């Protein structure tokens, strides 16, 4: 059965937070608001009156999944033999092992919470208590990004896209991290106009922030300055030296990043959307997160001033 019994919930809270956990609450609702992913979320009222979310993991989930990962690795071994993409295996081992210890995502969320405290554009729920199998955070509600994808005014969609773009370009500058690969479930629209970010399970660390070579590359690509574009690309890791590349192939490569900054306000959309081999990680991560944000923006059909935000936040993009 999907919902875990109250006794087991109390057992988890006892094992993780102690037998006196109830003293930290003004109230605690023993029936789960959500209950799917090897565990469930409860709503409660903390001692100071703040509404709180309490994520609690199923007791047997840990070892079960730990065995299952080894299992899937082999089975695909057999598959590798049978028909020569296992990156999927790496990828979901990586995403799954995050859930074995909530403290990881909790720490990422802490980082973003301090970095974006009292920010006029972003809202991050504060981590109140953290344990391997239990994590308590501030309850935060607003219009989910999925809802805004399906319905809602163009103004709202443009706002969400703008917020996500600002998050993508601005995160590595504020703290040496990126929010990572996201889906619209991670975001919501608060009444005051801020974007709420409530999932940090795929946060990517990025020491030093964006390499200036990115902004340089996109800028020079827009300016058609090939003679200075190519060396900056070879320096960025975009290209290898001694590589026969056609100029189109370059354009083909960079249009995904250059087209939105050709104009003052670019209209992200699905239709436009339709159209790493020894890379350095400090280049590979930005491209992937940016791709994520672009996909979401196209889902939002958002009109985003990417040129201004880049110019302000992306190193090396501003005119020299």
Author numbering: 98 to 181, 185 to 375, 393 to 437
What do the authors say?
Here, we show that MSMEG_1954, which has 79% sequence identity with MABP-1, is responsible for macrolide antibiotic resistance in M. smegmatis. Similar to MABP-1, MSMEG_1954-form 1 and MSMEG_1954-form 2 are both composed of two domains, the kinase-like domain with a phosphate-binding loop (P-loop), and the N terminal accessory domain that consists of six α-helices: α1–α4 helices (residues 1–114) and α6–α7 helices (residues 158–199). As demonstrated in MABP-1, MSMEG_1954 also has ATPase activity with a kcat of 0.00864 s–1 and Km of 0.231 mM, values that are comparable to that for MABP-1 (kcat = 0.0137 s–1, Km = 0.285 mM). The structural studies verified that MSMEG_1954 can assume two different conformations, the closed state (MSMEG_1954-form 1) and the open state (MSMEG_1954_form 2 and MSMEG_1954-ADP).
No electron density for the N-terminal 97 residues (α1-α3 helices) in MSMEG_1954-form 2 was detected. The SDS-PAGE results of form 2 crystals showed four bands, suggesting that the missing N-terminal 97 residues in MSMEG_1954-form 2 were probably degraded during crystallization. However, the N terminal accessory domain in MSMEG_1954-form 1 and MSMEG_1954-form 2 have different conformations. In contrast, the remaining α6 and α7 helices of the N terminal accessory domain in MSMEG_1954-form 2 are positioned far away from the kinase-like domain, in a way similar to MABP-1, which leave the substrate binding pocket open. Structural superimposition shows that the MSMEG_1954-form 2 and MSMEG_1954-ADP complex have similar conformation to that observed for MABP-1 and MABP-1-erythromicin complex structure. For MSMEG_1954-form 2, the degradation of N terminal 97 residues may decrease the steric hindrance, which release the compact arrangement of N terminal accessory domain. It is likely to represent a transitional state between MSMEG_1954-form 1 and MSMEG_1954-ADP complex structure.
